[PDB]
Write a protein that binds this ligand. Structure first.
Ligand SMILES: *[C@@H]1O[C@H](CO)[C@@H](O[C@@H]2OC[C@@H](O)[C@H](O)[C@H]2O)[C@H](O[C@@H]2O[C@@H](C)[C@@H](O[C@@H]3OC[C@@H](O[C@H]4O[C@@H](C)[C@H](O)[C@@H](O)[C@H]4O[C@@H]4O[C@@H](C)[C@H](O)[C@@H](OC)[C@H]4OC)[C@H](O)[C@H]3O)[C@@H](O[C@H]3O[C@H](C)[C@@H](O)[C@H](O[C@H]4O[C@H](CO)[C@@H](O)[C@H](O)[C@@H]4O)[C@@H]3O)[C@@H]2O[C@H]2O[C@H](CO)[C@H](O)[C@H](O)[C@H]2O)[C@H]1O
Ligand SMILES: *[C@@H]1O[C@H](CO)[C@@H](O[C@@H]2OC[C@@H](O)[C@H](O)[C@H]2O)[C@H](O[C@@H]2O[C@@H](C)[C@@H](O[C@@H]3OC[C@@H](O[C@H]4O[C@@H](C)[C@H](O)[C@@H](O)[C@H]4O[C@@H]4O[C@@H](C)[C@H](O)[C@@H](OC)[C@H]4OC)[C@H](O)[C@H]3O)[C@@H](O[C@H]3O[C@H](C)[C@@H](O)[C@H](O[C@H]4O[C@H](CO)[C@@H](O)[C@H](O)[C@@H]4O)[C@@H]3O)[C@@H]2O[C@H]2O[C@H](CO)[C@H](O)[C@H](O)[C@H]2O)[C@H]1O
Ligand SMILES: *[C@@H]1O[C@H](CO)[C@@H](O[C@@H]2OC[C@@H](O)[C@H](O)[C@H]2O)[C@H](O[C@@H]2O[C@@H](C)[C@@H](O[C@@H]3OC[C@@H](O[C@H]4O[C@@H](C)[C@H](O)[C@@H](O)[C@H]4O[C@@H]4O[C@@H](C)[C@H](O)[C@@H](OC)[C@H]4OC)[C@H](O)[C@H]3O)[C@@H](O[C@H]3O[C@H](C)[C@@H](O)[C@H](O[C@H]4O[C@H](CO)[C@@H](O)[C@H](O)[C@@H]4O)[C@@H]3O)[C@@H]2O[C@H]2O[C@H](CO)[C@H](O)[C@H](O)[C@H]2O)[C@H]1O
Ligand SMILES: *[C@@H]1O[C@H](CO)[C@@H](O[C@@H]2OC[C@@H](O)[C@H](O)[C@H]2O)[C@H](O[C@@H]2O[C@@H](C)[C@@H](O[C@@H]3OC[C@@H](O[C@H]4O[C@@H](C)[C@H](O)[C@@H](O)[C@H]4O[C@@H]4O[C@@H](C)[C@H](O)[C@@H](OC)[C@H]4OC)[C@H](O)[C@H]3O)[C@@H](O[C@H]3O[C@H](C)[C@@H](O)[C@H](O[C@H]4O[C@H](CO)[C@@H](O)[C@H](O)[C@@H]4O)[C@@H]3O)[C@@H]2O[C@H]2O[C@H](CO)[C@H](O)[C@H](O)[C@H]2O)[C@H]1O
Ligand SMILES: *[C@@H]1O[C@H](CO)[C@@H](O[C@@H]2OC[C@@H](O)[C@H](O)[C@H]2O)[C@H](O[C@@H]2O[C@@H](C)[C@@H](O[C@@H]3OC[C@@H](O)[C@H](O)[C@H]3O)[C@@H](O[C@H]3O[C@H](C)[C@@H](O)[C@H](O[C@H]4O[C@H](CO)[C@@H](O)[C@H](O)[C@@H]4O)[C@@H]3O)[C@@H]2O[C@H]2O[C@H](CO)[C@H](O)[C@H](O)[C@H]2O)[C@H]1O
Ligand SMILES: *[C@@H]1O[C@H](CO)[C@@H](O[C@@H]2OC[C@@H](O)[C@H](O)[C@H]2O)[C@H](O[C@@H]2O[C@@H](C)[C@@H](O[C@@H]3OC[C@@H](O)[C@H](O)[C@H]3O)[C@@H](O[C@H]3O[C@H](C)[C@@H](O)[C@H](O[C@H]4O[C@H](CO)[C@@H](O)[C@H](O)[C@@H]4O)[C@@H]3O)[C@@H]2O[C@H]2O[C@H](CO)[C@H](O)[C@H](O)[C@H]2O)[C@H]1O
Ligand SMILES: *[C@@H]1O[C@H](CO)[C@@H](O[C@@H]2OC[C@@H](O)[C@H](O)[C@H]2O)[C@H](O[C@@H]2O[C@@H](C)[C@@H](O[C@@H]3OC[C@@H](O)[C@H](O)[C@H]3O)[C@@H](O[C@H]3O[C@H](C)[C@@H](O)[C@H](O[C@H]4O[C@H](CO)[C@@H](O)[C@H](O)[C@@H]4O)[C@@H]3O)[C@@H]2O[C@H]2O[C@H](CO)[C@H](O)[C@H](O)[C@H]2O)[C@H]1O
Ligand SMILES: *[C@@H]1O[C@H](CO)[C@@H](O)[C@H](O[C@@H]2O[C@@H](C)[C@@H](O)[C@@H](O)[C@@H]2O)[C@H]1O
Ligand SMILES: *[C@@H]1O[C@H](CO)[C@@H](O)[C@H](O[C@@H]2O[C@@H](C)[C@@H](O)[C@@H](O)[C@@H]2O)[C@H]1O
Ligand SMILES: [Hg+2]
Ligand SMILES: [Hg+2]
Ligand SMILES: [Hg+2]
Lengths: 436, 436, 436
């Protein structure tokens, strides 16, 4: 009886499962690795740290490889609960990676916002907001240290660790640009908060110290790294209307084998606002009360999952004038594309089309070479922004092809592309194999 | 000092870890794959789409392989907040997969509900409810597009992609059956909502386009796929009592190497109701107020994690009259079996017994061949449904072997089995290797 | 058009991705394993089960290997909602694993609490609280069965399953120690609850039944298992102050290659209290009301994510008098170290420093050999516990280096270390390869 009687229940169908076993689940032989050690070492910041300033850092040569890089900020909030929305993330307006004077990659705060909405999830996502925002209903004058982790190719997997020991003739530098106005920190809407303190910044880099043999190999052999890059040519001007369904054809200007496309429609006035403001809880300032105004967001709750507040009705991509795929609704790129390829949840207003089976995986799993496409176009169709945004009965009970009239402020269309490239390192210098 | 001093801290115990390294963590060599392309293409639906109708789809031969399949619905809700519970999931009452006139697999909406409770988790689970339900407190007349993803063997992993190019003489068809009455959409309890609109449906299939060489291999060589199937012989009649602890012996009728058994006790009146209704928040209509009634659920909050509202007291499986394992409580199959083999959280009323180490993994990891077992029996023992369901003090403060008196409505016992089978494809035709 | 036109978009950059494919994503060849069967079998408990008693279990020789071990408790709560905090976890005060009279590992309830805060996440974490606590607002007299899963080396992965068949001359035993006082079960603060019932306990072990060939191999060949151990030498006395920033140097006493260090500052009066109590919602009894008292916690909500209530200001580790790394804030070890190496969220008051790239992975990925370090020291600096804990305006709006004055009760410093060791099994006996 018990488990022993199940072993005897053996048939001809068990041949495909346990005939001539190849593996066993009860004796794992673990692999031996190269000895190493990790150390986070602070960097020297060049320039005056402050709102709207540009500072830079030259990675000091302390170890052999570098992996994680974290930017620490110390901020004091100037409003009460729910008056900030990822202020430390917005403060890092853009960051540029440079090797030997050559730009390797460059990221922007809106990419950080888009990456978080698509590729982070669950408790990891909430821990990221602890690191970049106040999440415990803090009041005016609350001071907190923030940690903004960079997400370049060598920051996301140790298998792509940048070998400083193999770059003795090339300097690795980071160029930071700080935001000028950060909601709930030094500005409240358009009005500056008097006495707002300037931020304090520090850059920390995680170094890998290698053993003698592997140290000789990294310094003497040629290296080829399959890296990822971000492409972003600037915001596009979206033209959603309140009386009809407007349409647009945005000529894409991407290159290289691309893993996926990600885009959003943002109101440039408010950071991370990808949906329309409405008089429903969490969608505007003072929603549900007599102080409600659809002009100002509920800053702490800027994001939403309500598709009714998104602006995109349908979309398709055209490749040299012909449809790459049939037109799908905006909710398809927000719900189904992430469901099929990511496995998390994406707030409304952020859209994805993946050419890869696993876009969040470092291992390539399907790409499209935009360098061989003369004309790639994103054909868009917007909803009719005809719903009264101040009426909860109108917002919570309408049809599929309409949205709130406040959606006309979503005029900044940001389109991102993640591509692959090859970083060759030899003779103490590194350079990208493909420039377009 | 720092990391370099840790490298010198090297001893005899490091032999098992870093002696003669076999791998390294700082130089991943990514694998090269076969070139391909993906495209979601809409299908033609045969039949009249409507409540209680049967429609079918013949997969058009656009590409070489097919992977994901999504069913789109457009529904208009007829109630206010919390009056629907996965209506798009319930609308897809059953779906049958057919190759060359032969049924490969067939799923049911209650399986979709059971699969979601056991094998989805975290934000992925919440995104699935966005795709199949209203989750933003929408009101009467709210229209929304829903996406129901199918979970057949070729829908869950690209490694089992169905080769249409290798099936030139066999037709692949899907047979859908739409539910007649959907709570909060066209019915409110037992009463039909006047003017309810019929649903609109579309079927979308993701095709894989292969390169020349791999296209020749799929069309010329014989293929063998290790696939998974669902077994379900219909609901069993549970007989829980309010005066004593009833017991039952359900003769199982499964075959093939089975990964796991999953079952629930459902009140057939309400979709997804696996637990008893009670006058505690979320467990009945208007709970905690003067309008409370334990006759009607809080439809939007039909599920629960409260074990006190589950009906099963203990259970064991018998194999040819002898115990396959010792009797365990119902909470063991709801909490511990999922904890040990899945790693999520399962609402009360859904139970699991796994023969596999990783039941959610495609790779077989332990099965039981039910084709070699003459008598397999699920021995059940129910709690005494003696608690007053209208008393919060009685429901929130009782013992282990009792439940609410409303648990006597959980009379539909659905037992599911997930088994493996082999799909052989050769000479343009496909067929299963094992029929029993 | 469509997907076929993307295949033709092929360039010279595709050489690194799809030239001479090595793998394919659309034809997975699954591996065949050794036939086995699993069965959970109840053990005999030696001794009188009760609060503050020591009981033991000798693993009966029913199967060939053992994997999961679960301890079942049945408890009756003596308070209302929010008056318990993981009572079943605290009840298992310590558990010791013994093979042939030799201790292999020993765990404590505070380690269970620390492990849960660091290495569990998402729905898995919530399911663990369902198994060890009341989570549905149960009232006085509510009875519930609890399941405490052990987390020894053979409990966390089947690849380290303990071979009882290879230990015919060595006895495997578990030594349990039950807590004396459990909040909300038999005590309310310092006052005993009259009529509190003694707990009932049962131990269940999952056995693996192997096929004939693999059974002969396990019983005849020598085995070497790379296992993990917990190190804990007892609580350290922390000395945080309310008038200045105190500092300490705790001489660590660890050995063997260590994966990570984890520590917390606990008020020994309250289980799992790692942060200061304050008059903000969830941080003290009756917070926000006229019955608020910062002397008693909100037991059901003892944990918090508010860094302002943590006590540690900065920390660094010294190796033979020299800095292993530069000083970082306490929030770095609570937010960034888990973000970089775990990927979940860790409540405030629990800190981590990882020597491994993946500390939660069984496969070694970086260690530090503490057996070769003469002096390892944890240098600590505490915040100034000068904030009025009864003032929400003072707690929700202060600076980085201060905390509530109630933080002076966090006087128990628990430092944990997870190391590797080798378990050799030969001639029917097992023994560890390294003792220090
Ligand atoms: C995003 O979503 C989150 C999750 O839903 C929201 O948090 C929830 O808010 C609702 C709560 O029931 C729930 O507990 C909470 O989780 C979040 O809401 C915003 O942030 C929260 C923290 C609230 O802000 C706090 O609100 C109270 C303020 O305190 C003052 O309150 C007065 C009533 C007192 O008279 C005064 O003395 C202050 O309180 C004292 O100090 C506080 C800190 C102590 O807690 C309190 O003792 C209990 C007193 O100590 C003696 C805080 O300054 C502020 O940080 C939301 O505020 C809404 O909900 C409150 C429960 C309510 O009291 C608020 O009304 C006050 O403020 C509004 C204007 O905001 C005034 O018109 C009103 O007269 C009153 O003064 C208010 O309804 C926050 O939400 C508001 O502000 C947002 C800013 O972007 C946004 O505009 C939003 O729509 C607003 O609702 C969400 O952002
Ligand atoms: C599942 O769990 C969820 C999470 O807990 C629940 O959501 C929460 O509900 C409690 C809220 O505090 C919390 O914010 C929310 O997240 C969910 O509850 C059900 O769905 C929610 C959305 C509520 O439904 C909304 O309730 C308000 C209704 O509006 C009417 O309210 C009247 C009081 C007004 O007079 C009338 O004008 C309407 O409001 C106006 O329109 C709305 C849309 C605007 O928001 C409002 O402005 C603020 C007004 O605009 C001018 C909505 O139609 C409805 O969708 C739950 O309803 C309960 O909680 C409400 C806060 C409360 O107001 C409700 O009372 C009303 O309805 C009950 C009957 O339902 C009447 O007896 C009462 O007189 C009053 O009219 C109610 O207590 C939903 O829960 C209820 O219905 C469920 C149906 O299955 C179920 O029966 C449940 O037990 C009920 O409680 C959970 O389903
Ligand atoms: C679900 O859970 C909720 C808690 O989370 C419950 O609410 C709690 O109920 C207990 C209260 O102590 C607590 O405050 C409350 O939160 C809920 O219980 C049911 O609903 C509550 C609100 C009670 O209903 C009220 O009961 C009184 C009725 O009024 C009549 O009372 C008579 C004594 C008078 O003689 C008669 O004139 C009526 O009063 C008049 O009209 C009302 C509307 C006015 O408010 C009142 O003036 C103040 C009078 O005006 C002249 C109300 O209509 C009704 O809403 C529960 O009722 C139980 O508890 C009451 C305290 C008690 O009085 C009730 O006895 C009455 O009703 C029973 C029949 O139920 C009669 O046989 C009896 O003669 C008497 O008339 C009763 O013990 C409700 O619970 C009952 O009904 C449930 C189904 O609806 C269920 O069947 C339950 O087991 C019953 O106990 C929970 O449902
Ligand atoms: C941890 O975080 C959780 C998530 O926030 C908290 O749960 C939330 O609490 C706030 C709710 O709005 C929310 O719905 C809930 O999720 C949790 O809070 C603690 O646990 C919860 C479940 C509450 O305990 C319940 O509180 C109600 C008690 O019932 C009695 O209430 C009286 C008002 C009635 O007069 C009496 O008849 C009782 O109710 C009856 O029986 C109950 C079970 C029925 O539900 C009710 O019908 C609706 C009646 O049936 C006829 C329960 O015994 C108790 O388990 C929190 O309690 C706070 O919030 C309640 C909403 C409020 O009513 C409570 O006030 C009562 O108790 C306080 C003292 O606790 C008294 O001073 C007051 O006079 C009143 O009697 C209370 O404000 C729990 O929180 C409290 O206790 C904790 C113990 O550690 C802790 O001390 C905390 O700070 C306290 O707030 C969090 O622990
Ligand atoms: C989508 O957005 C649009 C634009 O914001 C919105 O239209 C606005 O509605 C308010 C009205 O003052 C504006 O002129 C109009 O632009 C639309 O609301 C829904 O459709 C509109 C056209 C109205 O419907 C018309 O109502 C009158 C009725 O005779 C006619 O048959 C119908 O087409 C909205 O009705 C609301 O506003 C009316 C002015 C008011 O008279 C209605 O009350 C009647 O009906 C309600 C139930 O719907 C009864 O309870 C009440 O006793 C009375 O008979 C009503 O308040 C309509 O909104 C309503 O219906 C939709 C579903 O179609 C949703 O449930 C809304 O939540 C609900 O308010 C938005 O759908
Ligand atoms: C489980 O479900 C059953 C069936 O629903 C339920 O039993 C019902 O209780 C209500 C009663 O009217 C019904 O006849 C009965 O079927 C049971 O409730 C708990 O057990 C029952 C038997 C009652 O206990 C008996 O109470 C009277 C007491 O003299 C005797 O020693 C005891 O065995 C429930 O007590 C509640 O209902 C009584 C009618 C009432 O008198 C009680 O009040 C007394 O006790 C409370 C504290 O318990 C005091 O605050 C109060 O001043 C007075 O002294 C009480 O309301 C009993 O419920 C109570 O106790 C359990 C734990 O045993 C839980 O805490 C409940 O939440 C609590 O109400 C359910 O457990
Ligand atoms: C951190 O913790 C410490 C110790 O708990 C706390 O200091 C306590 O504050 C209360 C006071 O009674 C105690 O003596 C003191 O130990 C500190 O609070 C913040 O700093 C202290 C020093 C006070 O600031 C001083 O306030 C008076 C002002 O003239 C002077 O310039 C300033 O340095 C706290 O101010 C609060 O308490 C005062 C007694 C009261 O007068 C203040 O009211 C004035 O200011 C508020 C706005 O801040 C106006 O709305 C009001 O009309 C009046 O002008 C105030 O209540 C100070 O707390 C306040 O400011 C901080 C940011 O610096 C946070 O926003 C607080 O939430 C807010 O209350 C803690 O930061
Ligand atoms: C959207 O619909 C709202 C309700 O009718 C309008 O208030 C809003 O108008 C805008 O904001 C108001 C307050 C005014 O400033 C208008 O000039 C402005 O156009 C609509 O956008
Ligand atoms: C469960 O216990 C409840 C409280 O005593 C009963 O109301 C309920 O009875 C059912 O529902 C009521 C409203 C009536 O319709 C009865 O005929 C029915 O049996 C119990 O099931
Ligand atoms: Hg393309
Ligand atoms: Hg079996
Ligand atoms: Hg060390």
């Amino acid at each position: 009886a018990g488990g022993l009687s199940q072993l005897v229940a053996y048939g001809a169908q068990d041949v495909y499962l346990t005939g001539n076993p190849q593996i066993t689940f009860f004796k794992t032989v673990y692999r031996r690795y190269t000895n190493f050690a990790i150390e986070s070492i602070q960097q020297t910041i060049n320039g005056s740290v402050g709102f709207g300033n540009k500072v830079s850092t030259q990675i000091s040569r302390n170890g052999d490889l570098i992996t994680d890089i974290v930017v620490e900020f110390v901020l004091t909030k100037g409003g009460n609960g729910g008056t900030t929305y990822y202020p430390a993330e917005e403060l890092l307006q853009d960051v540029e990676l440079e090797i030997g004077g050559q730009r390797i990659d460059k990221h922007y705060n809106d990419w950080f916002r888009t990456y978080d909405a698509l590729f982070r999830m669950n408790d990891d996502r909430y821990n990221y907001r602890r690191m970049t925002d106040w999440v415990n209903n803090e009041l005016v004058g609350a001071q907190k240290r923030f940690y903004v982790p960079l997400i370049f190719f060598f920051n996301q997997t140790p298998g792509l660790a940048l070998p400083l020991i193999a770059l003795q003739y090339h300097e690795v530098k980071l160029y930071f640009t700080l935001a000028s106005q950060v909601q709930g920190v030094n500005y409240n809407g358009s009005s500056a908060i008097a006495g707002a303190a300037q931020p304090t910044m520090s850059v920390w880099v995680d170094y890998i110290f290698l053993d003698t043999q592997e140290r000789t190999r990294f310094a003497q052999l040629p290296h080829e790294y399959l890296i990822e890059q971000l492409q972003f040519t600037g915001s596009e001007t979206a033209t959603p209307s309140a009386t009809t369904q407007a349409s647009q054809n945005i000529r894409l200007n991407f290159n290289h084998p691309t893993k996926y496309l990600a885009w959003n429609f943002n109101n440039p006035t408010n950071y991370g606002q990808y949906t329309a403001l409405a008089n429903i809880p969490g969608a505007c300032s003072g929603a549900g009360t007599a102080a409600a105004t659809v002009t100002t967001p509920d800053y702490g709750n800027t994001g939403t999952y309500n598709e009714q507040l998104a602006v995109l009705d349908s979309a398709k991509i055209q490749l040299n004038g012909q449809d790459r795929f049939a037109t799908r609704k905006g909710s398809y790129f927000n719900k189904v594309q992430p469901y099929q390829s990511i496995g998390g949840v994406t707030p409304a207003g952020v859209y994805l089309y993946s050419f890869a089976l696993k876009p969040a995986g470092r291992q390539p799993s399907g790409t499209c070479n935009f360098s061989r496409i003369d004309n790639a176009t994103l054909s868009l169709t917007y909803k009719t922004c005809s719903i009264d945004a101040t009426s909860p009965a109108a917002v919570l009970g309408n049809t599929e092809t309409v949205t709130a009239n406040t959606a006309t402020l979503l005029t900044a269309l940001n389109i991102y592309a993640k591509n692959y490239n090859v970083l060759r390192i030899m003779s103490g210098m590194g350079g990208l194999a493909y420039a377009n």
